[PDB]
Enzyme design. Sequence first.
Site, PDB file in Angstrom:
ATOM      1  N   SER A 100       0.834  -1.195   0.000  1.00 37.82           N
ATOM      2  CA  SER A 100       0.000   0.000   0.000  1.00 37.82           C
ATOM      3  C   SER A 100       0.877   1.258   0.000  1.00 37.82           C
ATOM      4  O   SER A 100       0.896   1.993  -0.985  1.00 37.82           O
ATOM      5  CB  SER A 100      -0.964  -0.021   1.191  1.00 37.82           C
ATOM      6  OG  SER A 100      -1.989   0.947   1.052  1.00 37.82           O
TER       7      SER A 100
ATOM      8  N   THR B 218      -3.278  -7.514   2.834  1.00 37.91           N
ATOM      9  CA  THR B 218      -3.032  -7.145   1.438  1.00 37.91           C
ATOM     10  C   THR B 218      -2.269  -5.819   1.288  1.00 37.91           C
ATOM     11  O   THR B 218      -1.497  -5.647   0.339  1.00 37.91           O
ATOM     12  CB  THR B 218      -4.350  -7.072   0.641  1.00 37.91           C
ATOM     13  OG1 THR B 218      -5.295  -6.254   1.339  1.00 37.91           O
ATOM     14  CG2 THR B 218      -4.931  -8.468   0.444  1.00 37.91           C
ATOM     15  N   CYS B 219      -2.478  -4.897   2.227  1.00 36.39           N
ATOM     16  CA  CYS B 219      -1.798  -3.597   2.213  1.00 36.39           C
ATOM     17  C   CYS B 219      -0.323  -3.673   2.652  1.00 36.39           C
ATOM     18  O   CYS B 219       0.416  -2.696   2.501  1.00 36.39           O
ATOM     19  CB  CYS B 219      -2.566  -2.578   3.069  1.00 36.39           C
ATOM     20  SG  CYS B 219      -2.973  -3.129   4.743  1.00 36.39           S
ATOM     21  N   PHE B 220       0.100  -4.816   3.194  1.00 37.29           N
ATOM     22  CA  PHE B 220       1.512  -5.057   3.511  1.00 37.29           C
ATOM     23  C   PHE B 220       2.065  -6.319   2.833  1.00 37.29           C
ATOM     24  O   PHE B 220       3.156  -6.776   3.183  1.00 37.29           O
ATOM     25  CB  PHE B 220       1.705  -5.192   5.024  1.00 37.29           C
ATOM     26  CG  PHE B 220       1.074  -4.089   5.825  1.00 37.29           C
ATOM     27  CD1 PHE B 220       1.752  -2.900   6.049  1.00 37.29           C
ATOM     28  CD2 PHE B 220      -0.191  -4.249   6.374  1.00 37.29           C
ATOM     29  CE1 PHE B 220       1.172  -1.888   6.796  1.00 37.29           C
ATOM     30  CE2 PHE B 220      -0.776  -3.243   7.122  1.00 37.29           C
ATOM     31  CZ  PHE B 220      -0.094  -2.059   7.331  1.00 37.29           C
TER      32      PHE B 220
END
Length: 375
Positions: A326, A348-350
């Site tokens: 992200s 999902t953002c990392f």
Amino acid sequence: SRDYKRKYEFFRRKLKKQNDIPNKFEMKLRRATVLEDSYRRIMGVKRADFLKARLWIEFDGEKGLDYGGVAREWFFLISKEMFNPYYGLFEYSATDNYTLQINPNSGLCNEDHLSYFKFIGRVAGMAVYHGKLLDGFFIRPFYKMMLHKPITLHDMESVDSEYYNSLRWILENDPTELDLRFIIDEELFGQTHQHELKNGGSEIVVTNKNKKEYIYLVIQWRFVNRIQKQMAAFKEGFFELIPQDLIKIFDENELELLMCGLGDVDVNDWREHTKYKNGYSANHQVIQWFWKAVLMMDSEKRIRLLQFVTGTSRVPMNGFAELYGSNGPQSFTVEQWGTPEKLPRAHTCFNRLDLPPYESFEELWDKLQMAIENT
Ligand SMILES: */C(=C\C(=O)OC)CNC(=O)c1c(C)n(C)c2ccc(OC)cc12
């Protein structure tokens, strides 16, 4: 020449927006009849260009949703139906493969089968036009037929390896003494079915002089002859949305990636650009088992694991050394989180897999593939 990324951006620049078209395309469907309702509307439009408008879709009279997401859901739902072998338009290429080809007996279900191939073609074109993916992988010869590329013996390897080796043998050796004829034996319902490759084919002997012809006619019978009208209906629909001039920029790999999002992931490149935290390490036992598990998964299932941990399927350009999260760059990583009873979770953002320290390889396989069954 340009690489895939530049190719795609070039392609997008050339794909001009439609002026003389209503500013949106309205269609209202019902989940339980998503095929019949999608077909009726998309094949009923005055002009195919109406499909190029922004997609305003509505399921079951459920009013007030984000149409960018409802449409993405539709592409998922309509794909599942179109490509279900139950209907007889498409079928699995082989008992051991997950890839799809056109069923040559499509006309027996439905005399009107061809208009359904045009529909599937339009929806595929719509996926490409609006930047969404179909859910389904085709055999390589499907993608070549779209690009008007010749089907080769090399394309037989990916589908049916035993048959490819018999034809490669014939290619590399003199077959004359085998006394082969210009015919093809096919096994169907435990019976033998012999088809002429050409006029009086049973009486013509395969030799070094006519074998290049032989291999060609075989490949045609396997991938083309019985499916010409179907593919030609699918292309007509597909090309009503994407000019076939524009699609030729891509080759068959790049096209699959474009339409469906392959599907061919180097697991070595994956492994060597991965981080380990919270106790885990490069050689920890659980991590060994993890890399074993991934190794044995289907190229379809490897991607569905990548979707889950990343966000969506699309391995970055230059491999796994340049994966982005992200906020800025983010290498694929695995963290020792939680306890064996719970499944693995994904940030999902990392781009990170929270993975419990499981006691067995088969337990790891059970829990890992359960948590993937969602997308
Ligand atoms: C035909 C049997 C088969 O698999 O042989 C190739 C089964 N297909 C259908 O019954 C069917 C249904 C229920 N619907 C809605 C269809 C739409 C289109 C087609 O086109 C082949 C078949 C359909």
